[model samples]
Target: KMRDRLFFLLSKYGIRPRDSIGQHFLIIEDVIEKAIETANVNENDVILEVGPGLGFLTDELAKRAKKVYTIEIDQKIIEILKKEYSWNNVKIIQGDAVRVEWPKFNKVVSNIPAKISSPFTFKLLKTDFERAVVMYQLEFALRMVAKPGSRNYSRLSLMAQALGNVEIVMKIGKGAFYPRPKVDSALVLIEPRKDKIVLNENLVKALFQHRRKTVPRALKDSIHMLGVSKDEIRGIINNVPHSNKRVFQLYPEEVKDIEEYLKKHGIIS
Candidate 1:
């Protein structure tokens, strides 16, 4: 019946899946049920569901959650959602979620639209939330949970770790969707630490641009952007231990140490 419903929607609504946007609707019932289970939802939970394509997850969420604010970027999908879901507990929002000012919510559970994963994730982590269970492309999920010296580790991994603890809940195959994606996906659970060390995102990204370069060297190249003189940059690095180590080799806290040193020295405000 679910498969038939998906086929009927695709045929009746002329909804052609766009590969460019990574538009793959999750049609597998078991996977859908698993995602909900991983979320650990309750009747008291207010959920923010991102990219609820075709309302499969959205409907289920509305049934479980106290309130569901579901944001969809695709216009066609929004039209379908408006007509399909009239539940008082569900609020359908239409816009680029990255640009919109998201309302407050206790929990977030989404099969995130792959294209917006980076920016959307950055914004989400900055907000106050109990936990988030999100499905991301396999490689992206690897980067999210990668360690300091690992090849996959980068700004993404650092920022994610600095903000909270990340763990892979389940691995989802490509066949779970309507127009199956080329790559597999994974569900990640992210819970914020009680006290997170917030860092300047711009600086963090700049530092990692030269991930292979020594800290001083990386800072030297980014001097103009950091608004710090070369001498000041050198001074900041001198104060930090193992200053000559490659940027990628440093832990997230070590990177924060450099940032604090720079800020304290009035090199960057």
Candidate 2:
């Protein structure tokens, strides 16, 4: 239903969705409803939505929120949002949301561009907010909530875990977005840590594969994953600290230690 409206708007604007900006207009209605409800927006609330495409959620946010600060980078998309409503409560800022000076808001809800996921979330947690209902890719969400020694565990997992209580709110199917095959998005509820918050990937991926095995043996066995040979790993094992113990049990700190060793020895850059 809305896709027809979306297409009509697309042609009227004389442009397709921009790729460099990661503009994927949210087509599904239920996902935005869920995101708004999960945030529990109130009349007294000031909502900060990152990417306000088409004003579907933007209009909804303005309905409940005392004021809405919706940032849209794309001029074409912003024009669509502008004509959709003239609500006084909603202020559509035209600029890159990442670098823009964000106004004060208690709750944040948006399907922020996936390309900006890493930098965006990092910036989100820094803001003073009661709670945030943000959309992330399924695999990305997994990494956010992933525990140590788990398959998804990595720099993303640790940093996210350290910053907030990331709970998987809901998962969206492949057809959730306007574009086909938008592989399973996730709506995550980030409960603030009220405190504070990467390097390479190959070594960590290989090391975590055998969390139960010793460091030397684990890295040694997964040599192919490292793009190195048996000869290179031969000397690296002894150089690594706690190579004797089952260092898959190593904490994030210890994991960093191993990476530093590898970097020092010209293993990983």
Candidate 3:
């Protein structure tokens, strides 16, 4: 019924939701309740929502949170929203989620676009938000909370874990979306640390480039990315922690040690 209504609503404007990218609108009524529950919205909370396709979730959040700030990129949908929906507490800013200037908020509850997943995630982490309950492709969600030694483990795994606690909160079928995506989706929660963790991104990138190699060898093989001379690499290569471990097996803290070691060597600025 909701899906049929969405079609009529869009067809009224002679438009279709983008499918080649991640413009799929949520058509499941139950999902809205699940998201609101997962986000733990309160009367005083300020929520940042991205890609408010039909403003379904936006309106729900507005009813609960103190205020809701949304960034909707599509002008077609933006115009439709301006005509169909109006709320004093719900501020609709039109721009790409990744580049838009965001209002300060305590938490984020958004259905992130699949195309901007990586960039938008990095930007979200850069913010001082307390926590975020976001929807992402199931595949990307797996990598976000991936464990060491798993094939899914890589730069994304390390970086996301290093910064905060990321968990797979819920999984949903493709039927939940109007356009229907090629794959299923999951809701992932990111709770950032008060005293945040930091790691050398370049070092992590270099190591994972040769993921199967021993830590020392991986660093040596990918030292070009580290911006360290061959002589300098050799000087600290033997002293590298978790020397016997492969690149992917080293924990986030282990990488931080290597980062500190490099810093002590004046290798990275």
Candidate 4:
């Protein structure tokens, strides 16, 4: 609640915010609690806390969860957190989470640094986690959970949506952080689908790689890229209804059908 406490810590410790590090520090406790609750953390949960600046929320998570493995990029903050916290349950890994082989954690709860949001989200989603609750720049959070056919419905959405259900659970005010970023932050909850209905992930990636064209057109283009003929693509689409709809207009289910059609034509493996 005291921004001056954070300010003093920054100045007294000579902690200059590295723009490249994406070091926007959070000082507000309500925002921190909101993030923790949104993740639905409990005594049995094993949580991965990214960017545990000063261990404010990390300490709380340690109290709630069985284990809190925090990855801190800043050595100074890592050292400080290590020195202050006495619990064996808290493991402060002084390295980039992006580079580390993370332990098998069912849930991920973090107030993510803005610079690493996209990469970190994708990386975690690609891994075997049941659920993730993260704080991202509000705009990025919106885009991550954006609907299909919209401008924000893009490669990020295609990749992310393939894995799970993404939603913005809550919004945090700019005052939540010590440095007070210009944009607000949103807490995004991602629960990986138990049975994702995608036909092929590689095809989804490629189709959205050129998302401008219609589904039939894009499928044919993909087939053509694989050296297949127009006759084959047309033949594949013969039995599928609405096969000519634009690629962007096809819902996740339609995309799956298209993938199966492509495989039938031997355009995809």
How well does each candidate superpose onto the true structure, as a TM-score? 0.91, 0.71, 0.91, 0.88
lDDT of 1 by residue, 135-246 (tens): 9999999989998888878888888889999999888898887798989999999988988978887778878897988888887776554466555556666775558778
lDDT of 4 by residue, 1-269 (tens): 44565665666567777757777787777777777887888888889999987777888889889888889888987776766566778888778878887886778888888778877876886778867888888889888887877876776776677778998988988877756688999988888898876546677766776787876666556544465655655677566545667666567777777767666757676
Error of 2 at 238 (Å): 16
- Residues forming the 10-long window of minimal summed lDDT in candidate 1: 223-232
For all predictions, the C-alpha RMSD in Å is 2.1, 7.1, 2.2, 2.4
What TM-score would you give candidate 3 relative to the actual structure? 0.91
Of 3 and 4, which scores higher on lDDT?
3
Tens-digit lDDT track of model 2 for 46-106? 9888887777788889888999888988777787776767788988888987788888888
Candidate 3 lDDT by residue in tens digits, 63-127:
88998999987788888777877777888898888788889898899898888999888777667
What are the clashing pairs of model 3? Answer: none
TM-score-better candidate, 1 vs 3: 1
Which ranges in model 1 have alpha carbons more than 4 Å from their true place?
225-235
* Ranking of candidates on TM-score, top first: 1, 3, 4, 2
Task: Assess candidate 4 and give its lDDT.
Answer: 0.76
Error of 2 at 20 (Å): 2.7
Q: lDDT score of model 2?
A: 0.75
TM-score of candidate 4 relative to the true fold: 0.88
